[PDB]
Design an enzyme around this catalytic site. Structure first.
Site, PDB file in Angstrom:
ATOM      1  N   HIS A   3     -92.172 -74.818 -40.493  1.00  0.00           N
ATOM      2  CA  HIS A   3     -92.838 -75.538 -39.379  1.00  0.00           C
ATOM      3  C   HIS A   3     -91.881 -76.478 -38.662  1.00  0.00           C
ATOM      4  O   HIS A   3     -91.714 -77.626 -39.067  1.00  0.00           O
ATOM      5  CB  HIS A   3     -94.072 -76.289 -39.870  1.00  0.00           C
ATOM      6  CG  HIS A   3     -94.900 -76.870 -38.732  1.00  0.00           C
ATOM      7  ND1 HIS A   3     -94.847 -78.136 -38.344  1.00  0.00           N
ATOM      8  CD2 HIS A   3     -95.817 -76.229 -38.027  1.00  0.00           C
ATOM      9  CE1 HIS A   3     -95.742 -78.291 -37.382  1.00  0.00           C
ATOM     10  NE2 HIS A   3     -96.342 -77.122 -37.188  1.00  0.00           N
TER      11      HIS A   3
ATOM     12  N   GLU B 289     -91.369 -70.254 -27.696  1.00  0.00           N
ATOM     13  CA  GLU B 289     -92.028 -70.191 -29.012  1.00  0.00           C
ATOM     14  C   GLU B 289     -92.888 -68.929 -29.108  1.00  0.00           C
ATOM     15  O   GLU B 289     -93.512 -68.528 -28.120  1.00  0.00           O
ATOM     16  CB  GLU B 289     -92.973 -71.369 -29.256  1.00  0.00           C
ATOM     17  CG  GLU B 289     -92.233 -72.702 -29.266  1.00  0.00           C
ATOM     18  CD  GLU B 289     -92.865 -73.649 -28.246  1.00  0.00           C
ATOM     19  OE1 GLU B 289     -92.708 -73.364 -27.047  1.00  0.00           O
ATOM     20  OE2 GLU B 289     -93.460 -74.658 -28.690  1.00  0.00           O
TER      21      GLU B 289
ATOM     22  N   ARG C  80     -92.593 -69.866 -37.688  1.00  0.00           N
ATOM     23  CA  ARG C  80     -92.474 -69.914 -36.229  1.00  0.00           C
ATOM     24  C   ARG C  80     -91.118 -69.319 -35.814  1.00  0.00           C
ATOM     25  O   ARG C  80     -90.093 -69.547 -36.434  1.00  0.00           O
ATOM     26  CB  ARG C  80     -92.610 -71.378 -35.761  1.00  0.00           C
ATOM     27  CG  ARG C  80     -92.479 -71.621 -34.259  1.00  0.00           C
ATOM     28  CD  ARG C  80     -93.826 -71.662 -33.546  1.00  0.00           C
ATOM     29  NE  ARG C  80     -93.925 -72.882 -32.727  1.00  0.00           N
ATOM     30  CZ  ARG C  80     -95.046 -73.500 -32.382  1.00  0.00           C
ATOM     31  NH1 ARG C  80     -96.212 -73.156 -32.894  1.00  0.00           N
ATOM     32  NH2 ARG C  80     -95.033 -74.554 -31.589  1.00  0.00           N
TER      33      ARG C  80
ATOM     34  N   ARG D 139    -101.889 -71.014 -38.702  1.00  0.00           N
ATOM     35  CA  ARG D 139    -100.741 -70.416 -38.008  1.00  0.00           C
ATOM     36  C   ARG D 139     -99.500 -70.213 -38.891  1.00  0.00           C
ATOM     37  O   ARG D 139     -98.629 -69.413 -38.551  1.00  0.00           O
ATOM     38  CB  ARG D 139    -100.363 -71.233 -36.775  1.00  0.00           C
ATOM     39  CG  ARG D 139    -101.187 -70.700 -35.617  1.00  0.00           C
ATOM     40  CD  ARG D 139    -100.788 -71.342 -34.293  1.00  0.00           C
ATOM     41  NE  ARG D 139    -101.682 -72.431 -33.892  1.00  0.00           N
ATOM     42  CZ  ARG D 139    -101.711 -73.689 -34.340  1.00  0.00           C
ATOM     43  NH1 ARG D 139    -100.823 -74.161 -35.214  1.00  0.00           N
ATOM     44  NH2 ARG D 139    -102.648 -74.499 -33.873  1.00  0.00           N
TER      45      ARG D 139
END
Length: 96
Positions: A85, A54, A69, A65
């Site tokens: 997410h 990650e 991702r 955040r």
């Protein structure tokens, strides 16, 4: 499986950041980096353990955040970009 790849040009300027941090093996700004992801979501074309990592891609005006991702593999050219997410996953085509 992955909804297909995602042209790096189709990605934000903060998406390339992670790819640069994976390529330059840091140094990484965010705390999200240098961790394994055993596709615990079973959404990724995994098979083996520790074959994933990650590396959340920074984002502007990202109060947090950000749902964004990046999920890299054990072999170059396998960096999934959720952008929801851990919801979706679209490999990164640097060539594109």
């Amino acid at each position: 499986d992955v909804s297909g790849t995602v042209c790096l040009s189709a990605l934000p300027p903060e998406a390339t950041d992670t790819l640069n941090l994976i390529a330059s093996d840091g140094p990484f700004p965010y705390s999200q980096d240098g961790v394994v992801f055993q596709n615990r979501e079973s959404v990724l074309p995994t098979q083996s353990y520790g074959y994933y990592h990650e590396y959340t891609v920074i984002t502007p005006g990202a109060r947090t955040r950000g749902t964004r991702r990046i999920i890299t593999g054990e072999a170059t050219q396998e960096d999934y970009y959720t952008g929801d997410h851990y919801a979706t996953f679209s490999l990164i085509d640097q060539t594109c």
